[PDB]
Protein backbone atom coordinates (compact mmCIF):
# COMPACT_ATOMS: atom_id res chain seq x y z
CA UNK A 1 0.00 0.00 0.00
CA UNK A 2 2.77 2.42 0.92
CA UNK A 3 4.44 1.53 -2.40
CA UNK A 4 1.85 2.77 -4.92
CA UNK A 5 -0.70 5.10 -3.25
CA UNK A 6 -0.46 8.87 -3.64
CA UNK A 7 -0.32 10.77 -0.38
CA UNK A 8 -3.71 12.43 0.25
CA UNK A 9 -3.79 15.97 1.57
CA UNK A 10 -6.10 16.91 4.43
CA UNK A 11 -7.97 19.16 1.95
CA UNK A 12 -8.61 19.43 -1.78
CA UNK A 13 -7.25 22.77 -3.03
CA UNK A 14 -7.98 24.92 -6.08
CA UNK A 15 -5.39 27.13 -7.79
CA UNK A 16 -6.80 30.27 -9.42
CA UNK A 17 -5.19 32.73 -11.85
CA UNK A 18 -6.01 36.41 -12.33
CA UNK A 19 -4.82 38.59 -15.21
CA UNK A 20 -5.49 42.31 -15.14
CA UNK A 21 -7.56 43.15 -18.23
CA UNK A 22 -9.28 46.55 -18.24
CA UNK A 23 -11.91 45.29 -20.69
CA UNK A 24 -13.40 42.92 -18.08
CA UNK A 25 -14.74 43.14 -14.57
CA UNK A 26 -12.52 41.95 -11.73
CA UNK A 27 -14.57 38.78 -11.23
CA UNK A 28 -14.45 38.00 -14.96
CA UNK A 29 -10.64 38.21 -14.86
CA UNK A 30 -10.49 35.44 -12.23
CA UNK A 31 -10.19 31.87 -13.57
CA UNK A 32 -9.83 28.45 -11.96
CA UNK A 33 -6.69 26.66 -13.15
CA UNK A 34 -7.11 23.23 -11.59
CA UNK A 35 -7.62 21.30 -8.37
CA UNK A 36 -5.54 18.72 -6.50
CA UNK A 37 -5.80 16.68 -3.28
CA UNK A 38 -2.51 14.72 -3.10
CA UNK A 39 1.12 15.66 -2.48
CA UNK A 40 2.10 14.28 -5.90
CA UNK A 41 -0.58 16.24 -7.74
CA UNK A 42 0.42 19.44 -5.91
CA UNK A 43 4.01 19.17 -7.12
CA UNK A 44 2.91 18.22 -10.65
CA UNK A 45 0.91 21.45 -10.80
CA UNK A 46 3.54 23.64 -9.13
CA UNK A 47 6.30 22.36 -11.44
CA UNK A 48 4.11 23.05 -14.52
CA UNK A 49 3.34 26.74 -13.90
CA UNK A 50 5.32 29.97 -13.87
CA UNK A 51 7.06 31.23 -10.77
CA UNK A 52 5.24 34.27 -9.38
CA UNK A 53 8.36 36.36 -10.09
CA UNK A 54 7.97 35.63 -13.84
CA UNK A 55 4.31 36.64 -14.12
CA UNK A 56 3.55 39.86 -15.90
CA UNK A 57 2.58 42.79 -13.64
CA UNK A 58 -1.06 42.71 -12.64
CA UNK A 59 -1.47 38.94 -12.25
CA UNK A 60 -2.35 36.93 -9.15
CA UNK A 61 -2.24 33.33 -8.06
CA UNK A 62 -4.71 32.19 -5.39
CA UNK A 63 -4.78 28.79 -3.64
CA UNK A 64 -8.05 28.18 -1.81
CA UNK A 65 -9.77 25.23 -0.24
CA UNK A 66 -12.09 23.57 -2.76
CA UNK A 67 -15.49 25.26 -2.48
CA UNK A 68 -14.17 28.68 -1.39
CA UNK A 69 -13.85 31.25 -4.16
CA UNK A 70 -10.80 33.65 -3.72
CA UNK A 71 -12.99 36.73 -3.28
CA UNK A 72 -14.40 38.76 -0.41
CA UNK A 73 -17.95 37.84 -1.38
CA UNK A 74 -17.63 34.13 -0.61
CA UNK A 75 -19.53 33.16 2.54
CA UNK A 76 -16.26 31.91 4.07
CA UNK A 77 -14.39 35.17 3.35
CA UNK A 78 -16.95 37.94 3.88
CA UNK A 79 -16.47 37.99 7.68
CA UNK A 80 -12.73 37.30 7.36
CA UNK A 81 -9.46 39.03 6.62
CA UNK A 82 -5.86 38.51 5.68
CA UNK A 83 -2.36 38.46 7.10
CA UNK A 84 -0.49 40.69 4.66
CA UNK A 85 3.14 40.40 3.53
CA UNK A 86 4.14 43.52 1.61
CA UNK A 87 7.28 43.15 -0.49
CA UNK A 88 9.40 45.98 -1.75
CA UNK A 89 10.50 45.92 -5.37
CA UNK A 90 13.88 44.31 -4.65
CA UNK A 91 12.09 41.47 -2.81
CA UNK A 92 10.60 40.36 -6.14
CA UNK A 93 14.05 38.85 -6.74
CA UNK A 94 15.04 37.76 -3.23
CA UNK A 95 11.89 36.64 -1.41
CA UNK A 96 8.73 36.48 -3.55
CA UNK A 97 9.01 32.91 -4.87
CA UNK A 98 10.45 31.43 -1.67
CA UNK A 99 7.77 33.11 0.49
CA UNK A 100 5.01 31.99 -1.85
CA UNK A 101 6.11 28.37 -1.87
CA UNK A 102 6.39 28.45 1.94
CA UNK A 103 2.86 29.87 2.05
CA UNK A 104 1.55 27.11 -0.24
CA UNK A 105 3.14 24.52 2.06
CA UNK A 106 1.70 26.13 5.21
CA UNK A 107 -1.69 25.70 3.58
CA UNK A 108 -1.47 22.15 2.22
CA UNK A 109 0.48 20.79 5.19
CA UNK A 110 -2.12 22.24 7.62
CA UNK A 111 0.58 24.04 9.58
CA UNK A 112 -1.67 26.09 11.94
CA UNK A 113 -2.59 23.28 14.36
CA UNK A 114 -6.25 23.39 15.50
CA UNK A 115 -6.72 26.70 13.67
CA UNK A 116 -5.99 25.41 10.18
CA UNK A 117 -9.79 25.13 9.81
CA UNK A 118 -9.93 28.95 9.95
CA UNK A 119 -7.63 29.19 6.91
CA UNK A 120 -9.44 29.83 3.62
CA UNK A 121 -6.45 30.19 1.27
CA UNK A 122 -3.67 32.49 0.15
CA UNK A 123 -3.08 35.06 -2.59
CA UNK A 124 0.02 36.46 -4.27
CA UNK A 125 -0.36 39.76 -6.14
CA UNK A 126 2.41 40.54 -8.64
CA UNK A 127 2.49 44.34 -8.92
CA UNK A 128 4.90 46.89 -10.37
CA UNK A 129 4.48 49.00 -7.23
CA UNK A 130 5.36 46.13 -4.89
CA UNK A 131 4.24 42.53 -4.57
CA UNK A 132 1.95 41.15 -1.87
CA UNK A 133 1.42 37.74 -0.31
CA UNK A 134 -1.48 37.09 2.05
CA UNK A 135 -3.12 34.25 3.99
CA UNK A 136 -6.90 34.62 4.16
CA UNK A 137 -8.83 33.49 7.23
CA UNK A 138 -12.54 33.08 7.73
CA UNK A 139 -13.46 35.30 10.73
CA UNK A 140 -11.63 38.53 11.53
CA UNK A 141 -13.16 38.64 15.03
CA UNK A 142 -11.60 35.29 16.06
CA UNK A 143 -8.70 36.70 18.03
CA UNK A 144 -7.09 33.43 19.15
CA UNK A 145 -7.19 31.85 15.69
CA UNK A 146 -6.05 34.95 13.82
CA UNK A 147 -3.17 35.79 16.16
CA UNK A 148 -1.98 32.17 16.25
CA UNK A 149 -2.00 31.89 12.46
CA UNK A 150 -0.09 35.17 12.16
CA UNK A 151 2.58 34.20 14.69
CA UNK A 152 3.14 30.78 13.08
CA UNK A 153 3.16 32.31 9.59
CA UNK A 154 5.71 34.99 10.42
CA UNK A 155 8.06 32.37 11.84
CA UNK A 156 7.66 29.94 8.92
CA UNK A 157 8.59 32.78 6.57
CA UNK A 158 11.63 33.48 8.74
CA UNK A 159 10.86 37.19 9.15
CA UNK A 160 13.14 38.92 11.67
CA UNK A 161 11.44 39.65 15.02
CA UNK A 162 12.03 43.29 14.03
CA UNK A 163 9.54 43.16 11.16
CA UNK A 164 5.84 43.74 11.89
CA UNK A 165 3.03 42.35 9.74
CA UNK A 166 -0.62 43.35 9.92
CA UNK A 167 -4.00 41.64 9.66
CA UNK A 168 -6.77 43.52 7.84
CA UNK A 169 -10.45 42.63 7.60
CA UNK A 170 -11.91 42.22 4.13
CA UNK A 171 -14.81 44.50 5.09
CA UNK A 172 -12.33 47.33 5.70
CA UNK A 173 -10.42 46.60 2.48
CA UNK A 174 -13.59 46.52 0.36
CA UNK A 175 -14.95 49.82 1.70
CA UNK A 176 -6.13 49.63 9.07
CA UNK A 177 -4.65 46.68 10.95
CA UNK A 178 -6.90 44.73 13.30
CA UNK A 179 -3.91 42.80 14.68
CA UNK A 180 -0.12 42.87 14.39
CA UNK A 181 2.59 40.29 15.10
Domain spans of the chain, in order of start? 1-181
Beta strand 119-125 pairing with 132-137: antiparallel
d(CA 157, CA 150): 11
Binding site, annotated residues: 26-27, 72-73, 127-132, 175
**Cβ contacts of 159 within 8 Å, gap of 6 or more:** 165
Q: Which of 49, 17, 9 is nearest to 124 (CA)?
A: 17
Resolution to one decimal, Å: 1.7
Please state the φ and ψ torsions of residue 97, each to the nearest 5 degrees.
Answer: -65, -40
With a CB cutoff of 8 Å and minimum separation 6, the contacts of 130 are 86, 87, 88, 89
Point out the annotated binding site for mRNA. 26-27, 72-73, 127-132, 175
Domain 1-181 part of CATH 3.90.1150.10: no
Task: State phi, psi for 65 to the nearest 5 degrees.
Answer: -55, 140
Amino acid sequence: PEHYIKHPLQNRWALWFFKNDKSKTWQANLRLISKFDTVEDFWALYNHIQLSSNLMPGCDYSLFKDGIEPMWEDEKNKRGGRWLITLNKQQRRSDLDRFWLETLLCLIGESFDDYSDDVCGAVVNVRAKGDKIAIWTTECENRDAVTHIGRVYKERLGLPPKIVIGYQSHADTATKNRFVV
